[PDB]
Design a protein around this ligand. Structure first.
Ligand SMILES: *[C@@H]1O[C@H](CO)[C@@H](O[C@@H]2O[C@H](CO)[C@@H](O[C@@H]3O[C@H](CO)[C@@H](O[C@H]4O[C@H](CO)[C@@H](O)[C@H](O)[C@@H]4O)[C@H](O)[C@@H]3O)[C@H](O)[C@H]2NC(C)=O)[C@H](O)[C@H]1NC(C)=O
Ligand code: HEM
Ligand SMILES: *[C@@H]1O[C@H](CO)[C@@H](O[C@@H]2O[C@H](CO)[C@@H](O[C@H]3O[C@H](CO)[C@@H](O)[C@H](O)[C@@H]3O)[C@H](O)[C@H]2NC(C)=O)[C@H](O)[C@H]1NC(C)=O
Ligand SMILES: *[C@@H]1O[C@H](CO)[C@@H](O[C@@H]2O[C@H](CO)[C@@H](O)[C@H](O)[C@H]2NC(C)=O)[C@H](O)[C@H]1NC(C)=O
Ligand SMILES: *[C@@H]1O[C@H](CO)[C@@H](O[C@@H]2O[C@H](CO)[C@@H](O)[C@H](O)[C@H]2NC(C)=O)[C@H](O)[C@H]1NC(C)=O
Ligand SMILES: [Ca+2]
Length: 595
């Protein structure tokens, strides 16, 4: 074993050991071991990393070197033969609204982020990789197979950069390579407030003692706030429409403007913070800016935890929920709350839940205009559609009235993401999210499918025949064997998502195991979990049990008709009720007395 303490985190840390508020970086959550779960630390390894040279080189790097006796198939080839399909008809989830997909992405970004390697401000490497597809140091190209149409119109590869790692970012020689998690492992709304003090600061409105988050000053949504714009140029959001020139938004998380619906969700939460903060000042006129800020923040963090654990996991894990996440019996300081490396791939099941279009609906939940339904790809890093095309209400109604895409063995990832993904850095709508995911497994030195099956105590198929029975699909099992020549080599992302779904769930057995464990840990390992005696009062907890995503929409948008259970498929107007019928968050329990 090697150094039990390498480390390039945010430096200076000193715990308050009486502070009723989480730190921004996640530090100090655990008392005996302060850095546990903090941002900018290595992702946890539940199993040893598997690299071509046992230390840092991904499998597929050295063409001649095999994995278990075989060549690992190209990411894009696996993408073309297994993940793609043409017919979007009949692909929608009959019982999960679009919000189901969307909330998952939110929880996801609150938990883990592995940014790519940074060594380019001045880089021509950013081009020796783009232009020539030359494999070298952190350039690990996604080569196009023979007969791939992109060869004819895009080039020879997709550029792709290895993820950052701990102890430098830079060159050489030590222990196995461990990727970084740039955000806090705890479900704490870090995505709204940021994971660095530096950013948490810039996001706040410190011009007034109200504890509000800064809002846009250039535009308004019917008197409702927008997230401030990011001042930094070049902006990708500006790029997709040189004429509208609208920048990306500035939020606690850098991926916020990835897609219009994710930016919509971010806006709702920022709105709830300021809403909470002003409602609190009304009750406690005495409280200062900091107190207003921390108490609202604390409330919002409880909201995310509650919606996630009460309404969202149950319908992901289905019958497996109880098997992995038992009833809460209290905080446990012996539990490692860190997000593991494999979790960040397991949680990518959501990619197969994204449909090809996004709609905007009007007050009666009718098409908003002539071009109400747009292709997903035209909305990547698209903020001008919100700002100069209706605000977020038409988008939010879409989230409630439309359905998520159903994971389907014959139709996995929509072409909008498989062939038209737009990356921050480059200029085309031609990347492949599926291939990227696959290349990224290898980059992260992930163990194979069967290593994880064994880890979860599940059978491990060694034969085509064995794979057919687990996957319950003859044809899918076959193309898989043809490309991988052995189950042991199947990349975890595609292997875990190819399994049939569990009863009342949306993921298979393997994924339910990987997801379930992770979630039980960040709950049980969180000293600030909302139900942990002492964090909130019994009276406060009674009030928080009433949160609902519907109420959230009611208090921060001009939608007045909403469903009671926002994550299940809901038809308008039968399943929609007036906001008055929806429980409000009673904040009197936060009222404070001096004398
Ligand atoms: C907070 O979470 C902690 C981390 O999970 C929990 O710690 C675990 O503690 C148990 C022991 O109490 C550890 O193993 C389990 O308990 C028994 C070991 O004493 C085992 O009993 C069996 O041991 C083997 C069989 O496996 C036999 O030889 C023996 O005769 C008996 O059958 C259990 O089967 C079980 O493994 C375990 O190492 C800890 N978990 C890990 C890996 O960290 C702790 O329970 C929690 N604290 C509390 C009590 O709330
Ligand atoms: C565009 C993208 C999305 C929506 C249109 C989208 C959606 C999701 C869902 C719904 C997720 C979970 C339910 C989910 C998880 C994670 N993603 Fe994904 N995602 C879009 C695009 C991307 C891109 C681009 C990446 C980067 C991939 C890379 O390897 O470089 C991406 C990643 C992830 C990810 C890992 C994050 C991390 O830990 O670094 C998820 C947990 N998504 N997305
Ligand atoms: C770049 O974003 C532009 C918005 O800044 C967008 O231009 C706008 O789009 C349409 C025309 O395509 C117009 O919106 C509609 O409503 C107006 C006025 O009510 C009508 O006059 C039109 O008929 C139209 O249907 C906007 O007026 C127009 N704005 C401007 C100033 O041109 C572009 O379409 C975006 N371009 C791309 C490539 O995405
Ligand atoms: C749509 O999914 C919802 C949400 O899971 C299903 O509703 C659950 O129904 C079961 C019946 O036992 C109950 O355990 C829960 O009360 C329900 N949850 C909620 C909040 O309603 C519903 O069955 C699904 N619709 C269909 C027709 O499958
Ligand atoms: C900081 O918060 C203050 C509110 O305290 C904002 O200033 C207000 O701005 C709104 C909109 O321009 C006006 O109705 C008020 O007159 C202002 N109120 C006061 C008391 O000045 C300000 O915009 C916030 N700053 C940022 C960047 O979001
Ligand atoms: Ca977090």
């Amino acid at each position: 074993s090697w150094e039990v303490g390498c480390g390039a985190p945010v430096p200076l840390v000193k715990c308050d050991e009486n502070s009723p508020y989480r730190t921004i970086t996640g530090d100090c959550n655990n008392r005996r071991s302060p850095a546990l779960g903090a941002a900018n630390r290595a992702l946890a390894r539940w199993l040893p990393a598997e690299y071509e040279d046992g230390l840092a080189l991904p499998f597929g790097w050295t063409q001649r070197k095999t994995r278990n006796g075989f060549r690992v198939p190209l990411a894009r080839e696996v993408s073309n033969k297994i993940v793609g399909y043409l017919d979007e008809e009949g692909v929608l989830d009959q019982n999960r609204s679009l919000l189901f997909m969307q909330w998952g992405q939110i929880v996801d970004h609150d938990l883990d982020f592995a940014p790519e390697t940074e060594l380019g401000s001045n880089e021509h490497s950013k081009t020796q990789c783009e232009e020539y597809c030359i494999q070298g140091d952190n350039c690990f190209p996604i080569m196009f197979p023979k007969n791939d149409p992109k060869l004819k119109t895009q080039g020879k590869c997709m550029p792709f950069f290895r993820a950052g790692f701990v102890c430098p970012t830079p060159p050489y020689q030590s222990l196995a390579r461990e990727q970084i998690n740039a955000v806090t492992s705890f479900l704490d709304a870090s995505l709204v407030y940021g994971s660095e003090p530096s950013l948490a600061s810039r996001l706040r409105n410190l011009s007034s003692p109200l504890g509000l988050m800064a809002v846009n000053q250039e535009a308004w949504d019917h008197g409702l706030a927008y997230l401030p714009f990011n001042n930094k140029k070049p902006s990708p959001c500006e790029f997709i429409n040189t004429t509208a020139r609208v920048p990306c938004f500035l939020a606690g998380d850098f991926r916020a403007s990835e897609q219009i619906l994710l930016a919509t969700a971010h806006t709702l939460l920022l709105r709830e913070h300021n809403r909470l903060a002003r409602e609190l000042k009304k009750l406690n006129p005495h409280w200062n800016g900091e107190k207003l800020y921390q108490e609202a923040r604390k409330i919002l963090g409880a909201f995310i935890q509650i919606i996630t654990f009460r309404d969202y996991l149950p319908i992901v894990l289905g019958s497996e929920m109880q098997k992995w996440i038992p009833p809460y019996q209290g905080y446990n300081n012996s539990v490692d709350p860190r997000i593991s490396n494999v979790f960040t791939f397991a949680f990518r099941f959501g990619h197969m839940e994204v449909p090809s279009t996004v709609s905007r609906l009007d007050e009666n939940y009718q098409p908003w205009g002539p071009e109400a339904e747009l292709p997903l790809h035209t909305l990547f890093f698209n903020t001008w559609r919100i700002i100069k095309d209706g605000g977020i209400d038409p988008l939010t109604r879409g989230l409630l009235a439309k359905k998520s895409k159903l994971m389907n063995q014959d139709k996995m990832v929509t072409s909008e993401l498989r062939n038209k993904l737009f990356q921050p850095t480059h200029k085309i709508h031609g990347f492949d999210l599926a291939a990227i995911n696959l290349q990224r497994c290898r980059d992260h030195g992930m163990p194979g499918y069967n290593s994880w099956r064994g880890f979860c105590g599940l059978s491990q198929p060694k034969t085509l025949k064995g794979l057919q029975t687990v996957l319950k699909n003859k044809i899918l099992a076959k193309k898989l064997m043809d490309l991988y020549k052995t189950p042991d080599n199947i990349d975890i992302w595609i292997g875990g998502n190819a399994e049939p779904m569990v009863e009342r769930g949306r993921v298979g057995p393997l994924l339910a195991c990987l997801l379930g464990r992770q979630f039980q840990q960040i709950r049980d390992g969180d000293r600030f979990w909302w139900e942990n005696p002492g964090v909130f009062t019994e009276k406060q907890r009674d009030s928080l049990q009433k949160f609902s995503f519907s109420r959230l929409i009611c208090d921060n948008t001009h939608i007045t008709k909403v469903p009671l259970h926002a994550f299940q498929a809901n038809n308008y107007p039968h399943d929609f009720v007036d906001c008055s019928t929806v429980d409000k968050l009673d904040l009197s329990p936060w009222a404070s007395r001096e004398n």
